[PDB]
């Protein structure tokens, strides 16, 4: 039935199992240090997070 | 100093000509089933001096080298050292050598073409069978 079919494909490792915590996009994601945000969202929120440019 | 006892400049083994000037374990590599590692293990278990060249060994030495080459498992050569392990049809572990053995077992592509497997079809069409891109590579011999 539809209950056993809907979203039944395993999503445990690939890019289909990860997304931006801000915009829910799946591309250019930064998993380092547990940020789990895409590149653009990280550039947007880097100063708030505490990442600042020195060199 | 060259050996007077008919130093074999050319030696015939398995319908192949090996060079007597070449050092052993590299002269017998000319056989189409033997390369480097197999030659070294065959000569180690045949107990012949590896510093000799192929022309200085006697007839008995070459004979026992040929026999140990054709019967690897009979002289404790490991099963993972062979190029025809668990051969389809007769599930026998073996080493295929030279014309009539290596090239005939090469003619197992007709099995793939008879079952019309995709790899056999790629072989029949002259294309590449191990999943490589064919856009910008391998453009030689294709007009």
């Amino acid at each position: 039935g539809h209950q056993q079919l809907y979203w039944s494909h395993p999503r445990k490792f690939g890019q289909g199992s990860r997304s931006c915590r801000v915009c829910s996009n799946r591309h250019g994601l930064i998993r380092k240090y547990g940020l789990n945000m895409c590149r653009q969202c990280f550039r947007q929120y880097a100063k708030d997070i505490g990442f600042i440019k020195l060199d | 100093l060259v050996i007077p006892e008919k130093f074999q400049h050319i030696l015939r083994v398995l319908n192949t000509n090996i060079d007597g000037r070449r050092k052993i374990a590299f002269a017998i590599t000319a056989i189409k089933g033997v390369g480097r590692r197999y030659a070294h293990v065959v000569l180690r278990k045949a107990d012949i001096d590896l510093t000799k060249r192929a022309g200085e060994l006697t007839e008995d030495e070459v004979e026992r080298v040929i026999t140990i080459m054709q019967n690897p498992r009979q002289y404790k050569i490991p099963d993972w050292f062979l190029n025809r392990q668990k051969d389809v049809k007769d599930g026998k572990y073996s080493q295929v050598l030279a014309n009539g053995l290596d090239n005939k077992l090469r003619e197992d592509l007709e099995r793939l073409k008879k079952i019309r497997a995709h790899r056999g079809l790629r072989h029949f069409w002259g294309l590449r069978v191990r999943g490589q891109h064919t856009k910008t590579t391998g453009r030689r011999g294709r007009t």
Binding site: - | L1, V2, I3, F7, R21, R53
Partner: protein, 72 residues
């Protein structure tokens, strides 16, 4: 063009190795190889044999360059 060097000495080339090589100012496997039409392995073996017999003096030995000179 393609040189055809020997792998073992013949009596003619084993000669002219025991009474001229011991007279060279510089004895090197490459020099003997070129001047006797023999392979590098054979040249090295012959020079080691000559040195064992005391006819040659070893000047320096290295994995890439071994130098001998006449005993004079």
């Amino acid at each position: 063009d393609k040189l055809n060097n020997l792998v073992l000495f013949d009596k003619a080339t084993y000669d002219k190795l025991c009474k001229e090589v011991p007279n060279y100012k510089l004895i090197t496997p490459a020099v003997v190889s070129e001047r006797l039409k023999i392979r590098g392995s054979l040249a090295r073996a012959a020079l080691q044999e000559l040195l064992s017999k005391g006819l040659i003096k070893l000047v320096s030995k290295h994995r890439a360059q071994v130098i001998y000179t006449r005993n004079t």
